[PDB]
């Protein structure tokens, strides 16, 4: 059995962008939507959508710059077997600010840029290149 659906969601993104597909599906949850909202805020994905009731199903519309994918890469930085926490001072920056991280703070799911402006830290999830 799979042990992280979040790294699964990131894997479905980089496989979809590489294969040049439009719609990518997975079973929905709150943090999956909240991460996809950060992706649409920064601009990487086109749109999120959810459809269902007994099993809600998140449908992520991917995005293409040209024939080239918008997302360069995406990696799971904190992982189930090894948890990484970043304090307010220690908040990292992805590729000299050109990328973003995803960070779960006390005040919710932010970027590293938004968490520096908010003035608090927490568990970093992934580096969006």
């Amino acid at each position: 059995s799979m042990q992280d659906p979040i790294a699964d969601m990131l894997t479905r993104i980089r496989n979809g962008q590489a294969a040049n597909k439009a719609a990518v599906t997975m079973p929905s949850s709150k943090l999956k939507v909240a991460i996809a909202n950060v992706l649409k805020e920064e601009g990487f994905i086109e749109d999120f959508k959810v459809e269902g009731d007994t099993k809600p199903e998140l449908e992520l519309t991917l995005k293409y710059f040209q024939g080239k994918a918008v997302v360069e890469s995406i990696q799971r930085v904190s992982r189930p077997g090894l948890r990484i926490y970043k304090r307010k001072d220690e908040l990292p920056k992805v590729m000299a600010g050109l990328g973003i991280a995803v960070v779960s703070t006390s005040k919710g799911v932010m970027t590293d840029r938004a968490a520096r402006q908010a003035g608090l830290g927490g568990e970093i999830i992934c580096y969006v290149a």
């Binding site: 077997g81 090894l82 948890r83 990484i84």
Partner: protein
């Protein structure tokens, strides 16, 4: 206010004597894993009324005999 800890018995019982294993969480500094540390303490009690496997609040006191320098205060849901 006093400082205090919470642990669980998981131990045999003797005359006015109970041991309390206190589990805690520490980040392991070389590899960054969060690892469960076990702090076992001998404890003084109110006429050994506690069970086994339940969760007990605990606090420091004078030595009452070898290593028995803690005393219990309150118990959540005694025995099972």
């Amino acid at each position: 206010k006093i400082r205090t800890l919470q642990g669980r018995v998981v131990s045999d019982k003797m005359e006015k004597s109970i041991v309390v294993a206190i589990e805690r969480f520490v980040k392991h500094p070389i590899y960054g894993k969060f690892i469960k540390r076990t702090t076992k303490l001998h404890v003084h009690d109110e006429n050994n009324e506690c069970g086994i496997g339940d969760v007990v609040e605990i606090r420091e006191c004078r030595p009452l005999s070898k290593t028995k320098s803690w005393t219990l205060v309150r118990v959540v849901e005694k025995a099972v």
